Each structure stands twice: as C-alpha cells, then as structure tokens.
Amino acid sequence: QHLVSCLETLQKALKVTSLPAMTDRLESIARQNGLGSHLSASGTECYITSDMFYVEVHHGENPVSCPELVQQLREKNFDEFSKHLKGLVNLYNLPGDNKLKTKMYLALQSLEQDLSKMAIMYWKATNAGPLDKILHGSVGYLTPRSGGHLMNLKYYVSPSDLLDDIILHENNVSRSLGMNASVTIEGTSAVYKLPIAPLIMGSHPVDNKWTPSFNSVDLPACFFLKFPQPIPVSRAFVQKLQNCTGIPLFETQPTYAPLYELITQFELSKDPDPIPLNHNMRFYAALPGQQHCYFLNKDAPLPDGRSLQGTLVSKITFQHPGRVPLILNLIRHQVAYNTLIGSCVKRTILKEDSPGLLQFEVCPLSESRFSVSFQHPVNDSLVCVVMDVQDSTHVSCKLYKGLSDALICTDDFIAKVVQRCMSIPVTMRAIRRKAETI
Amino acid sequence: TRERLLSALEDLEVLSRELIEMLAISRENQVLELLIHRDGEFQELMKLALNQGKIHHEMQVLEKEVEKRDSDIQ
Amino acid sequence: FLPLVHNIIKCMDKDQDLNALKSKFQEMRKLISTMPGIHLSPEQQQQQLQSLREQVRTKNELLQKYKSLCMFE
Amino acid sequence: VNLKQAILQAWKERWSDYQWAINMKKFFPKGATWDILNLADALLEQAMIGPSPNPLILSYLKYAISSQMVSYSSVLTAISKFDDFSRDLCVQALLDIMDMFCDRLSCHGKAEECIGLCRAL
C-alpha cells in the first residue's frame, strides 16, 4: 500500500501536461518527500509537516515570497522546487520534540541575527570589497538563509579559483565560487546552554560586545558550522582551536594518519575519475615553461618525532559567536596551507620524461611549515623554499642557499607573481624563471 | 514507421493499464521508464503525423494537376 | 495518448471501469491516428516532392516549346 | 657528474637509500673512500638548506654513516662547518647524526686518519 503510494509519485513525476496536471505534479512532489498536501481553491496548495508549511499561490509568520522559489515554479523547473523542499526538510530534521523545536529554531534565529550584525559592523568600519570580506573579514561574506538553504559564510576564496579560464566579484558572488561553510542548529547527545534572544543588545563601535547569558535554556543541542566537503585538519590545529573554544573538536578519538595523504585525497577527489591515480606521492605537473615532479614526502619526522597527522573535520560546534572569530582565524590558516600544497596534487601520466622533469619535493619540517627542495637552477647544490602558513592569507618563505651560490631570486618578486595569479606548483616556476632571466 | 508507432501505442496502453491496476489492487519504475521512452517516440512522430497529412493533401493536389496536364497533353 | 494514459492512472489512484473502457476507446482512436492518411517516412516524403516538382517543370517546358512552335507563318 | 647533481638525481626520482648507494657507486668508478669527493659536505649542504631538513637526504647521510661509506672524520668536520644556529630543527638533526657515531668514534685505517679524527673531535 505504502509502496503503491510511492509508486504513484514516480509515474506522476513523469506526467507533464497543463496547469491542472501541474497542480497534480505539485501533489506528486508532496508525497515524493513524504509531505501532506491541503489545497484551498485551485490557486493555493499547502504542504504541511511540523513547522515546515509553505504555500504556492508553526510559531512564525510566512517569511517571504522568495523570488528563487517563485521563479523556478513559474518556469518549467519542478525539479528545482523538489530540491528546495528537500533542503527545508533536512533543516527541520531536528529531533527535539515540539515546544523545544520552536525554542531551538528561535536560538538559530538569534545566532543568525548576531552573525549578520557582526558582518554589518565590519562593512561600516571599513567599506571593504566583497573579496576582502571573504579573505580577511570578521565572520565572512554572509548570505541570509533563503528557504531551505541555511546561512553560508565564505571562509576563503583561493587566488587560482577566483580566476576562471580574471573574475571581478561585484556583489554578484556565486554561492559555490570558493570555499563555503554553513551555520545550523543540530541535536547532540549532551546538553548545552544557547542564547534564545539576540545577544548583541549593546555593540561596542569597534568589534562587538555580547550581553552575558541568562536569555538562555539548556536545550540538548549546539550551534554547528558544517562544511560541505570535509576539510583535512592537522593535530596541532586541533590543539590551537581547542585553546579558544574548549569544546572537544573530535570528542571520541577516531583515526589519525599522515596529513599529506588526506590533502591529496581532498584535491584528487575534487574531480572524480574511475582510475585511482596510484601517485605513490610522486605527483607530476606540466606548466607553460618546463616540466616538474613533486614528491609530497609524508612520514618525514616533525621535531616531536611524529609525522604530521590529521583527520577530516566536517562539523565544528560553537556555543556562542564570541569564540567564532578566533576559531575562523585558525581555520582560515589551516585552509590556506592546504590550498598552497593542494595546488600541486594532479592526475597526470608523465611517463619516461627525459627533458626537464624539474622534480621538486615536500617534507613536513614542523606543524605549519614545509620545505620544497630543488636543485639550484644555475649551480649544483640543493636549494629550497619554505612556506610557513602563519595565517590563512599570509605565508612567509625563506630561500636559504649555500655560501657559494648564484643569487637565485628576490623574495618580493616571487610574491608579486604569486599574488597576481597563484598556485604553489606555480611558485616554483617563478623561482626558476627569475633566476634564469638574471 | 507506421508499424513502430502502432507498436509503441500498444505497449503504452498495456503497461499504463497494468500500473494503474496494480495501484488499484494495493488500494513500478520499470513500467514508468518504458512509458516515458515510447511516449517520447509517439510525441516526436505526432508533430510528424500532423504535417504528413497536410503534405499528403498537398501531394494529392499536385497529383490531380499532373494528371490533368498529362491527359490534356495526350 | 500519453495524457489519456496518465488520466487513467489518476483515476486508478482516486479509486473507473467506465474510465478503463474510455482508455480502450482512446486506443481505437490511436489506431485511427496510425492510419488517418498515414503511410510514409520523412525521407520518402522528400523524394516524392522532388519527383512531382520535376514532373511539373518538364511538362510545362514541353508545353511552352510547342507554344512557341508556330506552324502558321 | 658533480656530487651535487648526483645527490638530487637521487632526491628527484625518489631513490631509497640502498638504491642511492648502488647508483652512487655506478656514477663514480673511483670510490676515493668518498671523503676525497666530500660526500658528507654535499649531503649536509643540500639537506640543511630548508628550515627543516628533508628526510630523504638525511636518510642518505645516515645510511652513509651506518654503512661505512663515509669516515667519521669528514662527517664531524662537515658538522662543524654549519653554525647558523637560528634553526633548532637542523641542529637537532645534526645532534642525532652525532648521536649515531659518537662513543664508538672508531677509526680503522692509517694514523693520519686517526689524527684527523682527533682534530675532528
């Protein structure tokens, strides 16, 4: 009986005819997502579950006539409307009970208002362009929740990916054109105290001031900062991040292997192909001038004697937004280091390459530092460029050479070329070219 | 082509009837996929079916004209 | 055709026998839609048109040739 | 050709230490005990350029000490010529390398090698 009901949504989804049958297609969408449909007149039909009730013509007014939803329905995109309902259902997958669910949603609304105000304060203090806000701003470019989609804070926009095939952001910045993190309430086994009303009642003109808790209630949930694709993070970052918040980042200690392997998986899996690369940590890179091979050297001992080890993090839980500025600054740092080392990872088949193969390599000297070692471009001794990722957007590099050697490069010229475009497989090219030009 | 259209029509009717009857007995993605595939076949050749008839009427007119011309020539 | 089939499925979801009989009559109408003057493909339709055009042109040309041919000075 | 070119012809294509030993033998027919050619000097230069040493060329030097390719005297001189001292990681690597041979500190050769070991100590 229930399978025949699910059976009819499927054949009603392939049904496509006039407006009457398109209202029956909206009824199909309801039972497809296991929703309940009540229709008053031909014009208004309402899908109702919990507080997730919306009408195409609980505890809150109908918020907005979203153009997004209206445009999709007016045009022939019932599939897009189906995705939007799925997003709404996932947001309210909240367990809780009833009165607790309404309060828990209220807490999310307070957090959203506070985060929005904090973003506004940064714009008032400095009229920064969207790119500056995303790369180095309090919170991040923030899009308020629309329908199912929850608030997205853009932590970082990599220089290579800002450029597509020299994009100027404008206020039209795409939702996925960068690295994005979503803020949401999710149920937890433990019990926590969360603000149930806006906590930025009084705001100090520079930065923000939060009125102290209790209002608040001990709901069995915490605010979350879910990342759509899990970000590989190192053990050192877990300690640096914990120092501020205090909430255990990984709680039940799971697995923790070399970080460089996880960085390769994240980069390789961005574009999926059937054949596994089988890199053996010897990625080959082809560039406009010269050919390079990079050995990532995981398992190199750090000063402690343990190889850099880290575990993918998808959800970070924060009670209030006070520790959020500090947590984001550490993340920004972990993400930037991953991007520079990530740019090298590539799925190429450089086999039997006699010319060039100007191989470069990478050893983990310490958490937050790595050394790329290469033969001197003009002379013969090994030379290297470190890149400690001090901050998300800032890397400091020192090119030590032997006592008798040819001045390979000026640290500023390399920086100018990298900031113009970017990528670190790219940084090694600039070091080689500058040395050769001299 | 006529044969293909007739076969598609028969398949569609039987399978749609079977799916509806199973829904009725309870209170079928294989059937659904088959339906949409032959529905595309019928619809794409239904624009053709309509025009074919108009073209056939035009052809009949042309034939009449040719016949007259020949008979006149003879 | 497909709309009528979907309407029959909707009637089954609502439930009738009369509607199924109507679907059978629609299938008879379909057999009429297979042959209300249907008999040819898109290619054949193109060849027949070209042949008819060529025939009209040749007949008109022959008639004009004898139109000019004036037996009386 | 040069030792610097071989040591990274060894670092480039990832060579394990014994394959480095074989190919280092093959690149140079005269062994010259490897201390005339200053193996320890070239390995320390192209290992201690970065803030942290690359573990490949340190693995090469630790094999070239544990296997008796390189005398302890040339290693102790090449350790002595490093200083810089702003980097603790390179200094800790040098102290682990000294922790390898120290105490044994044994020369089985000519007496000039023993005098060289004395000056190197």
Swiss-Prot record, chain A:
Region annotation Interaction with the Mediator complex: where it falls in the sequence: 53-143, 146-310
Tissue/organ expression: Ubiquitously expressed.
Location within or outside the cell: Nucleus
Residue segments, region Interaction with the Mediator complex and THRA: 1-438
PTMs per UniProt: Phosphorylated by MAPK1 or MAPK3 during G2/M phase which may enhance protein stability and promote entry into the nucleolus. Phosphorylation increases its interaction with PSIP1.
Start and end residues of each stretch annotated as Interaction with ESR1: 1-438
Family: Belongs to the Mediator complex subunit 1 family.
Reported function: Component of the Mediator complex, a coactivator involved in the regulated transcription of nearly all RNA polymerase II-dependent genes. Mediator functions as a bridge to convey information from gene-specific regulatory proteins to the basal RNA polymerase II transcription machinery. Mediator is recruited to promoters by direct interactions with regulatory proteins and serves as a scaffold for the assembly of a functional preinitiation complex with RNA polymerase II and the general transcription factors.
The protein's name: Mediator of RNA polymerase II transcription subunit 1
Source organism (scientific name): Homo sapiens (Human)
Interval of the full protein contained in this chain: 56 to 518 of 1581
UniProtKB/Swiss-Prot annotation, chain B:
Chain coiled-coil ranges: 1-23
Top-level taxon of origin: Eukaryota
Localization terms from the record: Nucleus
Modified residues (Phosphoserine): 7
Function: Component of the Mediator complex, a coactivator involved in the regulated transcription of nearly all RNA polymerase II-dependent genes. Mediator functions as a bridge to convey information from gene-specific regulatory proteins to the basal RNA polymerase II transcription machinery. Mediator is recruited to promoters by direct interactions with regulatory proteins and serves as a scaffold for the assembly of a functional preinitiation complex with RNA polymerase II and the general transcription factors.
Known partners and oligomeric status: Component of the Mediator complex, which is composed of MED1, MED4, MED6, MED7, MED8, MED9, MED10, MED11, MED12, MED13, MED13L, MED14, MED15, MED16, MED17, MED18, MED19, MED20, MED21, MED22, MED23, MED24, MED25, MED26, MED27, MED29, MED30, MED31, CCNC, CDK8 and CDC2L6/CDK11. The MED12, MED13, CCNC and CDK8 subunits form a distinct module termed the CDK8 module. Mediator containing the CDK8 module is less active than Mediator lacking this module in supporting transcriptional activation.
Family: Belongs to the Mediator complex subunit 4 family.
Protein name stated in the entry: Mediator of RNA polymerase II transcription subunit 4
Species: Homo sapiens (Human)
Gene name of this polypeptide: MED4
Swiss-Prot record, chain C:
Single Gene Ontology MF annotation: transcription coregulator activity
Keywords: Acetylation, Activator, Coiled coil, Nucleus, Phosphoprotein, Transcription, Transcription regulation
Biological process, per Gene Ontology: positive regulation of transcription elongation by RNA polymerase II; positive regulation of transcription initiation by RNA polymerase II; RNA polymerase II preinitiation complex assembly
Coiled coil start-end: 43-70
Modified residues (Phosphoserine): 41
UniProt keyword Ligase, yes or no: no
UniProt-annotated location(s): Nucleus
GO cellular component, one term: nucleoplasm
UniProt function note: Component of the Mediator complex, a coactivator involved in the regulated transcription of nearly all RNA polymerase II-dependent genes. Mediator functions as a bridge to convey information from gene-specific regulatory proteins to the basal RNA polymerase II transcription machinery. Mediator is recruited to promoters by direct interactions with regulatory proteins and serves as a scaffold for the assembly of a functional preinitiation complex with RNA polymerase II and the general transcription factors.
Family: Belongs to the Mediator complex subunit 9 family.
Protein's name in the database: Mediator of RNA polymerase II transcription subunit 9
Source organism: Homo sapiens (Human)
Name of the gene this protein is made from: MED9
UniProtKB/Swiss-Prot annotation, chain D:
Localization terms from the record: Nucleus
Tissue-level expression: Ubiquitous. Abundant in skeletal muscle, heart and placenta.
Primary role: Component of the Mediator complex, a coactivator involved in the regulated transcription of nearly all RNA polymerase II-dependent genes. Mediator functions as a bridge to convey information from gene-specific regulatory proteins to the basal RNA polymerase II transcription machinery. Mediator is recruited to promoters by direct interactions with regulatory proteins and serves as a scaffold for the assembly of a functional preinitiation complex with RNA polymerase II and the general transcription factors.
Assembly and interaction partners: Component of the Mediator complex, which is composed of MED1, MED4, MED6, MED7, MED8, MED9, MED10, MED11, MED12, MED13, MED13L, MED14, MED15, MED16, MED17, MED18, MED19, MED20, MED21, MED22, MED23, MED24, MED25, MED26, MED27, MED29, MED30, MED31, CCNC, CDK8 and CDC2L6/CDK11. The MED12, MED13, CCNC and CDK8 subunits form a distinct module termed the CDK8 module. Mediator containing the CDK8 module is less active than Mediator lacking this module in supporting transcriptional activation.
Family classification: Belongs to the Mediator complex subunit 24 family.
UniProt-recorded name of the protein: Mediator of RNA polymerase II transcription subunit 24
Organism, as annotated: Homo sapiens (Human)
Lineage, uppermost ranks: Eukaryota, Metazoa, Chordata, Craniata, Vertebrata
Gene responsible for this protein: MED24
